[PDB]
Amino acid sequence: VDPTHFEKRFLKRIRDLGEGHFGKVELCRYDPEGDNTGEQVAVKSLKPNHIADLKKEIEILRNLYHENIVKYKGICTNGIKLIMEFLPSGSLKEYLPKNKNKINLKQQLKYAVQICKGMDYLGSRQYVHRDLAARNVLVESEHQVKIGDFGLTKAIETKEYYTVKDDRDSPVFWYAPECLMQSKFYIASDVWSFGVTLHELLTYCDSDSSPMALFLKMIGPTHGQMTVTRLVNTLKEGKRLPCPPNCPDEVYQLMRKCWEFQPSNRTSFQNLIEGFEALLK
Ligand SMILES: N#CCC(=O)N1CCC[C@@H](n2nnc3cnc4[nH]ccc4c32)C1
Q: Would I find RNA-binding among this entry's keywords?
């Protein structure tokens, strides 16, 4: 028997966990016994082409092994489903609003370290994530977080960046200037998205403090097609997202080092780790 092969007949849909534009993740129970004692697993499938994309995401996740990366469990098979461990606390977007009392600054800085280690492990395997947002960070417990989606993850050739072809559903408010302008994607461009994720983490993912809601105030919500070009000017000028409430200046400076206009002048994941670890001591 292949413990990574899940049979369709025993894979039972419970509820939806989230969706992209072509993908969706559901909570399922893999129940071969038929008595509802089987394990709960998270299942990624296509929304009814993108089979090639999902297949590449599977092969990428299958070979990543890190405590801050959601565990690959297997596949369900021309169609295919990705089986992962299920994390009941969901994403930081779900968890943080409901757990402000439990999650103090020290714990948010520990989550920040964990995101950086998982992201640094990804960079080391020569991958650019391209979609680092609090909605993609899963909560394992009060003491641990995991990167939980690799839907936009691309390999970097030999080259320092991956060049973007499809960009119509780009999370623009999480994107570095080189991504919004040229459509290039470096490890340093994931550092920029980490800065924005760190901002979300510090504001406990509150809808009103979202990087989009905030950036739409800094530019205007009624600009339709011109939003990105107007956003590109803001960053060109030198305007950044504000310091989150109750966020120490030492923390906000580590965040600003993620937001240098030029990728080569940006901090690394290793520097952020050292910087966060010094504040925790
Ligand atoms: N498609 C897509 C993205 C998507 O559905 N999500 C973003 C990544 C995390 C997904 N999610 N939400 N709650 C979850 C609990 N356990 C999980 N295990 C794997 C994903 C996942 C969960 C939800």
A: no
Q: How far apart are CA 117 and CA 148, in angstroms?
A: 14
Q: How far is the CA of 174 from the centre of ligand 1 (A)?
A: 19
CA dihedral over 200, 50, 128, 235, signed as positive or negative: negative
Take residue 185 and report the two structure tokens written for it: 């994607």
Q: What resolution in Å is listed for this PDB structure?
A: 2.1
- Tell me which residue has its CA closest to atom 5 in ligand 1: 18
Find residue 42's DSSP bridge partners.
27, 84
CB 7 within 8 A of CB 19: no
Question: Do 233 and 101 lie in a common domain?
Answer: yes
Tell me how the structure was determined: X-ray
CATH of the domain at 158: 1.10.510.10
Report the alpha-carbon distance of residue 251 to residue 151 in Å, rounded. Answer: 29
Write down which residue in 41, 61, 86 finishes a domain.
Answer: 86
**How many degrees, rounded to 5, is the angle at CA 143 between CA 106 and CA 272?**
50
**Active-site residue list:** 131
Q: If you compute the radius of gyration of the chain from its CA atoms, what whole number of angstroms results?
A: 19
Provide the domain limits for residue 150. 87-281
Does residue 94 sit in the same domain as residue 74? no
Instruction: Report residues whose beta carbon is within 6 angstroms of any ligand 1 atom.
Output: 17-20, 23-25, 42, 70, 84-87, 90-91, 135-136, 138, 148-149, 151
Of the residues 56, 86, 116, which one is the last residue of a structural domain? 86
Are 254 and 104 a contacting pair, CB within 8 Å?
no
Nearest to 194 by CA among 249, 241, 248: 241
Give the distance (Å) from ligand 1 centre to CA of residue 262: 32
Binding-site residues sit at: 17-25, 44
> Do 170 and 198 reside in the same domain of the chain?
yes
Number of domains in the chain: 2
